[PDB]
């Protein structure tokens, strides 16, 4: 069985950074793209970017350039998402997902990040 387990919820301050993690089991993350997807409360899915853990290649939506950094650790079958310079607009559930150009069949349960006021 494929599973993507995601890290626990984050309560963080404006201006800080946070690193979210997603650990895969039931497959090798080198064999597919791994993606991060943002969903603000009661709003839509937003593709942040992806990493190819086979070679480390990343692609991002330009709107997340600098805000988001995706990395992979193949030895632990884990991918990470660092979010920098946090503001209220970053309050969201962040999903990790696996797949390529035939759609993403596997999704983590998401990690809620709540940024407190002032940013």
């Amino acid at each position: 069985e494929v599973q993507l387990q995601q890290s626990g919820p984050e309560l963080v301050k404006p201006g800080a950074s946070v690193k979210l993690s997603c650990t895969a089991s039931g497959f090798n993350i080198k064999d597919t793209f791994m993606h991060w997807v943002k969903q603000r409360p009661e709003q839509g899915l937003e593709w942040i970017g992806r990493i190819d853990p086979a070679n480390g290649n990343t692609e991002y939506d330009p709107k997340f350039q600098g805000k988001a950094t995706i990395t992979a650790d193949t030895s632990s079958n884990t991918v990470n998402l660092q979010l920098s310079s946090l503001t209220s607009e970053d309050t969201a559930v962040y999903y990790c997902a696996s797949g390529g150009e035939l759609g993403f069949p596997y999704w983590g349960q998401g990690t809620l990040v709540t940024v407190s006021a002032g940013g």
């Binding site: 839509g44 692609e59 797949g99 150009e101 035939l102 759609g103």
Partner: protein
Amino acid sequence: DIQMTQSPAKLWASVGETVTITCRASGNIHNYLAWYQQKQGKSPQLLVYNAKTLADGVPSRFSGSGSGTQYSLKINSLQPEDFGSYYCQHFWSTPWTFGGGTKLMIKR
């Protein structure tokens, strides 16, 4: 970059009704289009890929169609389990963007 224009954003409907959700890409995406369903409180689930191919266990009342820039998901005679949100996504050039979503809600 290619963006997806999804309509309608909100749709009220009743069990047994037929509804159509559309997604228009800002450039040709060559049938590399998926539809996802996301139930309240849950993660998205892949419903359709390659514009028209049903994913695992998806009932025949769902139908994806379209080509070029213009795609649609039709739900024939919708069922109690079909309420929730729907999203299209393309996989042509990166970024692999989502449509803004459709919230399919029961008429009360």
